[PDB]
Amino acid sequence: MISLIAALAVDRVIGMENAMPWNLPADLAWFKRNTLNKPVIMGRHTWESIGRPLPGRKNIILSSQPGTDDRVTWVKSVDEAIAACGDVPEIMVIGGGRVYEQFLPKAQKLYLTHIDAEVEGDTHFPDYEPDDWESVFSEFHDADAQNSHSYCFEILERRHHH
Numbered sequence: 611m612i613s614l615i616a617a618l619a620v621d622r623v624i625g626m627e628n629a630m631p632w633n634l635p636a637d638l639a640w641f642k643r644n645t646l647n648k649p650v651i652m653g654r655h656t657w658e659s660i661g662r663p664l665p666g667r668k669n670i671i672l673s674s675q676p677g678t679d680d681r682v683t684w685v686k687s688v689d690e691a692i693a694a695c696g697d698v699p700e701i702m703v704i705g706g707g708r709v710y711e712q713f714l715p716k717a718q719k720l721y722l723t724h725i726d727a728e729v730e731g732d733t734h735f736p737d738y739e740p741d742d743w744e745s746v747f748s749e750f751h752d753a754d755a756q757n758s759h760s761y762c763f764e765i766l767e768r769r770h771h772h
């Protein structure tokens with residue numbers, strides 16, 4: 611099964627973790643917990659922004675060009691990315707914008723962090739029809755000395771497809 615995992619500011623703005631305007635170690639812990647021991651698929655912009663393979667996960671980079679780093683697995687299409695994951699229970703797509711857009715139709719689960727921040731970025735999470743999904747978990751957390759903004763984790767499971 612394919613899942614997307616994303617952190618969304620107001621207006622469903624996303625960007626690279628290393629440059630986003632919030633500081634949420636709690637969200638990074640959520641991301642790690644929900645991706646550990648699963649393959650992660652990302653585009654090249656996200657890969658370059660991380661710069662080092664995420665530990666304890668197979669890192670698959672979706673790029674139309676030949677790879678530039680032997681520490682990760684380079685693939686040229688959505689289908690090839692999925693094939694490279696082999697037989698695993700759950701494949702995690704970690705962005706960015708265009709990669710989420712291409713994988714959303716193949717996804718059956720979303721892990722979202724709804725962050726109470728308004729920001730300047732121009733990359734967005736894909737449009738999804740909320741009527742097609744069921745919320746099976748949600749937890750709000752206020753900001754604290756370690757986390758700059760309040761945020762709400764959510765897991766959604768797909769019920770319909772258009």
Ligand SMILES: Nc1nc2c(c(=O)[nH]1)N[C@@H](CNc1ccc(C(=O)N[C@@H](CCC(=O)O)C(=O)O)cc1)CN2
Pocket residue numbers: 615616617625626627628637638639640641642656660664665704705722723
């Ligand atoms: N929900 C959540 N989803 C996301 C992001 C996020 O921001 N949070 N941002 C994008 C993914 N980018 C990264 C980049 C780096 C890390 C990262 O570095 N993670 C460490 C945890 C951080 C740490 O404590 O060292 C890890 O091992 O997973 C996580 C997501 C897309 N989806």
Ligand SMILES: [Cl-]
Pocket residue numbers: 639640641643
């Ligand atoms: Cl968590």
Ligand SMILES: [Cl-]
Pocket residue numbers: 652653654655656657705706707709
């Ligand atoms: Cl990307």
Ligand SMILES: [Cl-]
Pocket residue numbers: 754755756
């Ligand atoms: Cl505190």
Ligand SMILES: [Mg+2]
Pocket residue numbers: 677679680
């Ligand atoms: Mg090589």
Ligand SMILES: [Mg+2]
Pocket residue numbers: 707708711734735736737
């Ligand atoms: Mg889009």
Ligand SMILES: [Mg+2]
Pocket residue numbers: 711736737
């Ligand atoms: Mg769309």
Ligand SMILES: [Mg+2]
Pocket residue numbers: 741769770
């Ligand atoms: Mg229904």
